[PDB]
Design an enzyme around this catalytic site. Structure first.
Site, mmCIF file in Angstrom:
data_model
loop_
_atom_site.group_PDB
_atom_site.id
_atom_site.type_symbol
_atom_site.label_atom_id
_atom_site.label_comp_id
_atom_site.label_asym_id
_atom_site.label_seq_id
_atom_site.Cartn_x
_atom_site.Cartn_y
_atom_site.Cartn_z
ATOM 1 N N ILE A 13 0.858 -1.177 0.000
ATOM 2 C CA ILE A 13 0.000 0.000 0.000
ATOM 3 C C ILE A 13 0.900 1.236 0.000
ATOM 4 O O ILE A 13 0.836 2.067 -0.903
ATOM 5 C CB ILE A 13 -0.897 0.021 1.239
ATOM 6 C CG1 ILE A 13 -1.646 -1.312 1.346
ATOM 7 C CG2 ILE A 13 -1.902 1.158 1.132
ATOM 8 C CD1 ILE A 13 -2.758 -1.300 2.375
ATOM 9 N N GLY A 14 1.759 1.341 1.007
ATOM 10 C CA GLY A 14 2.655 2.479 1.085
ATOM 11 C C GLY A 14 3.796 2.166 2.027
ATOM 12 O O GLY A 14 4.433 1.122 1.889
ATOM 13 N N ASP A 20 7.700 -1.288 5.275
ATOM 14 C CA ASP A 20 6.689 -1.256 4.228
ATOM 15 C C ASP A 20 5.378 -1.915 4.572
ATOM 16 O O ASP A 20 5.324 -3.042 5.067
ATOM 17 C CB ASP A 20 7.230 -1.824 2.928
ATOM 18 C CG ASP A 20 7.614 -0.739 1.977
ATOM 19 O OD1 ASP A 20 8.310 0.193 2.436
ATOM 20 O OD2 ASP A 20 7.225 -0.801 0.793
ATOM 21 N N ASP A 123 5.305 14.653 15.905
ATOM 22 C CA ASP A 123 5.200 14.764 14.450
ATOM 23 C C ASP A 123 3.745 14.908 14.001
ATOM 24 O O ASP A 123 3.270 14.192 13.116
ATOM 25 C CB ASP A 123 5.850 13.558 13.765
ATOM 26 C CG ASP A 123 5.962 13.729 12.251
ATOM 27 O OD1 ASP A 123 6.379 14.812 11.784
ATOM 28 O OD2 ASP A 123 5.634 12.764 11.527
HETATM 29 N N1 LIG Z 1 -2.945 0.974 9.226
HETATM 30 C C1 LIG Z 1 -2.861 1.561 8.018
HETATM 31 N N2 LIG Z 1 -3.982 1.431 7.208
HETATM 32 C C2 LIG Z 1 -4.091 2.033 5.970
HETATM 33 N N3 LIG Z 1 -3.044 2.811 5.495
HETATM 34 C C3 LIG Z 1 -1.902 2.941 6.306
HETATM 35 C C4 LIG Z 1 -1.743 2.317 7.610
HETATM 36 C C5 LIG Z 1 -0.437 2.649 8.113
HETATM 37 C C6 LIG Z 1 0.209 2.123 9.340
HETATM 38 O O1 LIG Z 1 0.206 0.639 9.222
HETATM 39 C C7 LIG Z 1 0.995 -0.106 10.105
HETATM 40 C C8 LIG Z 1 0.866 -1.568 10.190
HETATM 41 C C9 LIG Z 1 1.673 -2.350 11.077
HETATM 42 C C10 LIG Z 1 2.627 -1.636 11.886
HETATM 43 C C11 LIG Z 1 2.741 -0.199 11.796
HETATM 44 CL CL1 LIG Z 1 3.836 0.680 12.722
HETATM 45 C C12 LIG Z 1 1.952 0.588 10.930
HETATM 46 N N4 LIG Z 1 0.109 3.427 7.181
HETATM 47 N N5 LIG Z 1 -0.723 3.583 6.169
HETATM 48 C C13 LIG Z 1 -0.392 4.395 4.987
HETATM 49 C C14 LIG Z 1 0.527 3.621 4.038
HETATM 50 C C15 LIG Z 1 0.885 4.438 2.796
HETATM 51 O O2 LIG Z 1 1.526 5.658 3.253
HETATM 52 C C16 LIG Z 1 0.738 6.525 4.060
HETATM 53 C C17 LIG Z 1 0.238 5.755 5.328
#
Ligand SMILES: Nc1ncnc2c1c(COc1cccc(Cl)c1)nn2C1CCOCC1
Length: 289
Positions: A13-14, A20, A123
């Site tokens: 996803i990102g 990642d 942040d």
């Molecule tokens: N939960 C999420 N659901 C939808 N989108 C998400 C996230 C997170 C954090 O996910 C995790 C998972 C496991 C561990 C941690 Cl620390 C963080 N980040 N993003 C995006 C990714 C692309 O870039 C911008 C933010």
């Protein structure tokens, strides 16, 4: 790949603080989730802890599984939606005063919640605030605790000492003025940053944004110079006085001071009610056809 026994890893996803993010599926439960992979060759486990400490708070993503997987460290959390920045773009970069107040009420509570768990975010910015999906679609969630640190002791509520000469440690666009002075960051700083985010939504961009600089160091130096030369009254002209009140109140706090979250929220709630709005969770983007 099948991870943690019941999860199915999907496409990326990102990315997070240092890792990642993938969209996965909790196969047994039939729910989309988000999965971060961290090479066994480090931040996932430091977060897992700060994350499982925040467990239970509204707008705090849930951790569903933590473990090793062959050559990776795995953390699974609930799948969240678009960041406030994505949605802001989605609304032609314009938010009605009502959307801004609805977000502000929730955002201030999130920051209050974290501070009550002995941490300061460090942040606070638009990309680190995402809405939930499905049953949590009306809730503003906060993410990325990569820069989060304990500011007071659990027991003696002893506040971290005061110190200066510290390098900037977050985004400089939303950094508090004292962050720019090398001053150690505390509760007041998280709220001041939220403050810039709110005016950022009303204006479409901050006055210290898009400055012209040849080198990186000169750009940061110009942002800080500009954010110090722009009086809150000039920053907030044309917008309800409450945004100025909030900002002056934040900048005025003392290092170890405890913010009056209630006053700040009510500041906005009273305005909200005077305008005649209801806390119906009906944001601008919900009106997109
Ligand atoms: N939960 C999420 N659901 C939808 N989108 C998400 C996230 C997170 C954090 O996910 C995790 C998972 C496991 C561990 C941690 Cl620390 C963080 N980040 N993003 C995006 C990714 C692309 O870039 C911008 C933010």
């Amino acid at each position: 790949l099948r991870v943690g026994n019941r999860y199915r890893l999907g496409r990326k996803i990102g990315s997070g603080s240092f890792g990642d993010i993938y969209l996965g599926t909790d196969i047994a439960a039939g729910e989309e989730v988000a999965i971060k992979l961290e090479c066994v060759k480090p931040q996932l486990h430091i977060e897992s802890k700060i994350y499982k400490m925040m467990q239970g708070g509204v707008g705090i993503p849930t951790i569903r599984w933590c473990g090793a997987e062959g050559d990776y460290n795995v953390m699974v959390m609930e799948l969240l939606g678009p960041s406030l920045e994505d949605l802001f773009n989605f609304c032609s970069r314009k938010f009605s005063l009502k959307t801004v107040l609805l977000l502000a009420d929730q955002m201030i509570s999130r920051i209050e919640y974290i501070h009550s768990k002995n941490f300061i975010h460090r942040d606070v910015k638009p990309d680190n605030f995402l809405m939930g999906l499905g049953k949590k679609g009306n809730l503003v969630y906060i993410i990325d605790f990569g820069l989060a640190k304990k500011y007071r002791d659990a027991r003696t509520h002893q506040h971290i000492p005061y110190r200066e000469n510290k390098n900037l440690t977050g985004t400089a666009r939303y950094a508090s003025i004292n962050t720019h002075l090398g001053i150690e960051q505390s509760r007041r700083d998280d709220l001041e940053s939220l403050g810039y985010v709110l005016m950022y939504f009303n204006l479409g961009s901050l006055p210290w944004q898009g400055l012209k600089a040849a080198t990186k160091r000169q750009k940061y130096e110009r942002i800080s110079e500009k954010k110090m030369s722009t009086p809150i009254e000039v920053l907030c002209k044309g917008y309800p006085s409450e945004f100025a009140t909030y900002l002056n109140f934040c900048r005025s706090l003392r290092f170890d001071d405890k913010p009056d979250y209630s006053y700040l929220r009510q500041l906005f709630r009273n305005l909200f009610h005077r305008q005649g709005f209801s806390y119906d969770y009906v944001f601008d983007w919900n009106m997109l056809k």
